[PDB]
Amino acid sequence: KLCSLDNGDCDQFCHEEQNSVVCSCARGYTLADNGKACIPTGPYPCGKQTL
Amino acid sequence: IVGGQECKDGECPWQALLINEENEGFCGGTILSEFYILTAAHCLYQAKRFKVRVGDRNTEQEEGGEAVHEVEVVIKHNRFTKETYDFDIAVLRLKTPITFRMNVAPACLPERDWAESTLMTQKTGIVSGFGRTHEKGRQSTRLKMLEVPYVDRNSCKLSSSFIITQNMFCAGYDTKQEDACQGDSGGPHVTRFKDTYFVTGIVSWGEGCARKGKYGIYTKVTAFLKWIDRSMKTR
Ligand SMILES: O=C1CN(S(=O)(=O)/C=C/c2ccc(Cl)cc2)CCN1CC1CCN(c2ccncc2)CC1
Ligand SMILES: [Ca+2]
Numbered sequence: 001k002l003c004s005l006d007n008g009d010c011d012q013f014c015h016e017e018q019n020s021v022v023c024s025c026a027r028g029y030t031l032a033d034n035g036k037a038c039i040p041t042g043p044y045p046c047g048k049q050t051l
Numbered sequence: 052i053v054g055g056q057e058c059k060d061g062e063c064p065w066q067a068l069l070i071n072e073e074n075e076g077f078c079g080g081t082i083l084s085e086f087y088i089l090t091a092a093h094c095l096y097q098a099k100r101f102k103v104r105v106g107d108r109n110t111e112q113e114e115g116g117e118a119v120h121e122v123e124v125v126i127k128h129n130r131f132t133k134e135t136y137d138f139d140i141a142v143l144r145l146k147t148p149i150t151f152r153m154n155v156a157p158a159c160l161p162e163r164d165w166a167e168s169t170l171m172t173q174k175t176g177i178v179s180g181f182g183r184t185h186e187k188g189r190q191s192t193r194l195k196m197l198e199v200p201y202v203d204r205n206s207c208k209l210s211s212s213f214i215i216t217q218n219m220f221c222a223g224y225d226t227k228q229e230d231a232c233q234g235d236s237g238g239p240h241v242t243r244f245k246d247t248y249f250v251t252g253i254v255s256w257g258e259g260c261a262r263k264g265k266y267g268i269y270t271k272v273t274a275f276l277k278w279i280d281r282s283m284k285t286r
């Protein structure tokens with residue numbers, strides 16, 4: 001709980017959509033299976049500097 | 052840009068430059084996705100007919116992949132006020148999709164709350180463009196990027212000379228010669244969070260360029276999310 005402690009331990013969007021912490025990612029990213037990590041789905045996701 | 056670093060290979064891939072008929076840069080933009088570009092509403096009043104360029108870091112030496120695109124539709128904001136730079140924000144739907152490559156990718160759109168809470172409370176923020184290197188100077192061939200720190204809203208409103216509506220927020224410095232400038236308007240203002248940048252502003256306006264007792268006024272993107280969202284559904 002608490003998106004204040006450290007973004008709820010999320011890689012991105014954090015909400016207290018209930019009694020605890022709920023993570024979510026931007027469009028073009030899939031929330032990993034640890035409910036926190038954001039995994040790019042496409043070959044060129046938003047936010048990332050091209051490398 | 053006024054006194055900042057250069058955008059090295061692959062750092063400001065979400066930059067976009069609105070080009071005029073004589074093929075001169077005259078405003079900036081932000082790649083929201085393959086079909087949509089985000090810019091400042093008032094930029095549309097500076098050219099009879101323009102195009103949007105991407106993936107360009109040097110406006111002289113033809114580099115790898117810089118692509119030019121034509122505007123299908125221009126979606127200004129209903130409430131855009133000329134005299135008060137209020138509601139300075141637009142969206143451009145391109146006729147042909149954008150192919151993402153080195154120097155050409157989209158910046159992420161965040162969610163209002165989380166953004167205004169986490170993203171907007173960070174220390175600095177990045178702004179970039181091909182605008183004048185300093186006030187009375189010439190544009191700029193190289194693409195630059197400045198790390199401008201967020202400004203206190205109350206200490207912001209006080210420094211001004213014009214109302215700072217809810218659709219705005221200062222950013223920059225008191226005296227340190229560093230700030231956005233002519234030709235950057237419409238440009239992107241991004242906030243970095245865990246190696247992922249987010250659109251958090253639109254080069255709107257300022258009083259001069261990097262003047263003491265003044266800051267750069269940016270358009271508050273978080274207040275227009277739902278609007279931007281609708282626009283990217285064509286309307
Ligand atoms: O003094 C100026 C300077 N230019 S400029 O150099 O090309 C860009 C400035 C700029 C700087 C940093 C950043 Cl984040 C963004 C933009 C714009 C026009 N003027 C003249 C003024 C004229 C009156 N203005 C009002 C604003 C709101 N309400 C009423 C009036 C703003 C610009
Ligand atoms: Ca070039």
